[PDB]
Structures are given as structure tokens and as C-alpha cells.
């Protein structure tokens, strides 16, 4: 599934590219956070920084990181293609991930999936016939107490429903972001009832302590 080079345009290094020296100060901070003698531990956060700079990551960034961090570049390509954060097919801004595995399928995933499908038009895994909207489905993301979830770039959406699908994507295509918390009430992982957890405001060290 395109895991070899494929020297397309906006590729075939050196595609012209350069960082910010403020980001080089970040790189020096992360290498400061690691023990010397095993300097190659900075590959994942530095390469995450390269993704947060340039949306889908190209290859000249990886070649520059391999030049800086004194590693042979094939290890950098291994760590690049090994994960799903690091996408090399060209993507855009709104990176919709629909999470669906065990409770998310079991609580109407395909209603949400066909809602996204007939709202965006294009098929899953693909993108729109312009930029900035890439739709993929993914594995578990940790909203297991909720509906099958909608992840946009470092933001969650929980407890959805098809009318909320329509309203959220109306504001997204219009350029408005709602609160990235849950929906259908329950502002945390809550039982929606009348406080089935603790009721009294707790004390702490007033009751049981030891060796104080």
C-alpha cells in the first residue's frame, strides 16, 4: 500500500524545504531531555515536530533529521512508516478519524459511518476532490464509554448522533469548532444519574493516615 518510495512530484529529495531555528531550539531541548550515548531516542518527537510543521510529512524533512541526529536514514524511514500518525500520502487540515472497534461498533458505528459518507461524499480512506478533508476510520482511541468517536487534529468528539454529525460538520465546513468534550450531557466519564459516586466533599488526611 505504497510503502516503497514512488518518486512523485512534491517528493524526490531534495524538494526545497527548511525548518525554523526556533524549532531547532526545540530539537536541542528534546536532545537535552535524553541521555547522551544513545542520542537516537529523539527520532519520534523530532519527527512529530516535522509533521506539526508540514502537514503530511515529505522526505526531505526526514533526510534533514537523519543528517542532524547522526543516524543512517533507513532507521528514520522505518520509524516513519511504522506508525499511523506519520502519513506520507498528501493530506490536508481536517483529518477525520472515525474510531470503531469493540463498543464503538456495538453502539451504531455504521450509522455514523454512512452519515460521514453521505455528508462528505468521498469513500473512506480517501479525501475530497480538493484539499483539507481526509476521512479515515481507525482502531481504539479511548472513548470506549461513548459513541464511535470523531477525532480531528488533536481534538476529540464523543457521544455523537446523526443530527449532531450534521450540525458539527455544518460548523466545520463553515469554519467553526465546537467544544471538543463529550456530548449527550455527562461532561466527563459519568453515570448520568444522581451522583452514584461519592457525595460528601472529601477530607483527606483528617481520616486515616500512617506514620505521620
Amino acid at each position: 500500500a505504497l510503502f516503497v518510495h514512488r518518486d512523485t512530484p512534491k517528493n524526490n529529495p531534495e524538494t526545497p524545504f527548511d525548518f525554523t531555528p526556533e524549532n531547532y531550539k526545540r530539537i536541542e531541548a528534546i536532545v537535552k531531555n535524553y541521555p547522551e550515548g544513545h542520542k537516537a531516542a529523539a527520532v519520534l518527537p523530532v519527527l512529530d515536530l516535522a509533521q506539526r510543521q508540514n502537514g503530511w510529512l515529505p522526505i526531505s524533512a526526514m533526510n534533514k533529521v537523519a543528517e542532524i541526529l547522526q543516524v543512517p536514514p533507513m532507521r528514520v524511514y522505518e520509524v516513519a512508516t511504522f506508525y499511523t500518525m506519520y502519513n506520507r500520502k498528501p493530506v490536508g487540515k481536517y483529518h477525520i478519524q472515525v474510531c470503531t472497534t469493540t463498543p464503538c461498533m456495538l453502539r451504531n458505528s455504521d450509522s455514523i459511518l454512512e452519515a460521514i459518507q453521505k455528508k462528505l461524499g468521498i469513500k473512506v480512506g480517501e479525501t475530497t476532490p480538493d484539499k483539507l478533508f481526509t476521512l479515515i476510520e481507525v482502531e481504539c482511541l479511548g472513548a470506549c464509554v461513548n459513541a464511535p468517536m470523531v477525532q480531528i487534529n488533536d481534538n476529540y468528539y464523543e457521544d455523537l448522533t446523526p443530527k449532531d454529525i450534521e450540525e458539527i460538520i455544518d460548523e466545520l465546513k463553515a469554519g467553526k469548532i465546537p467544544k471538543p468534550g463529550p456530548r449527550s450531557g455527562r461532561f466527563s466519564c459519568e453515570p448520568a444519574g444522581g451522583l452514584t459516586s461519592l457525595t460528601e466533599p472529601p477530607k483527606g488526611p483528617g481520616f486515616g493516615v500512617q506514620a505521620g
Binding site: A29, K32, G37, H38, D154, G181, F187
Partner: protein, 41 residues
């Protein structure tokens, strides 16, 4: 208490994690080297 006492996270930008990592760059324990700077030194 009937109000979500988070939502100080609600205003996150892109560079917040790495900017915090740069903001805590000081008073560090030296993270000690062992001879070399890399195994392919």
C-alpha cells in the same frame, strides 16, 4: 460541583506540548553520558 473544572485545555494551539518542553529546559539533572555521544560515534 456541577461544572467541568477542566476546559483550561479548551484553548490548545498546535505547539503547546513542545513549547512547554522548551519552557522547562532549566534546573535539569545533567542526564549523564556514558563515554560516547552515540554507539556509532
Amino acid at each position: 460541583n456541577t461544572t467541568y473544572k477542566n476546559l483550561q485545555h479548551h484553548d490548545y494551539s498546535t505547539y503547546t506540548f513542545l513549547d512547554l518542553n522548551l519552557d522547562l529546559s532549566k534546573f535539569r539533572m545533567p542526564q549523564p553520558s556514558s563515554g560516547r555521544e552515540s554507539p556509532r560515534h
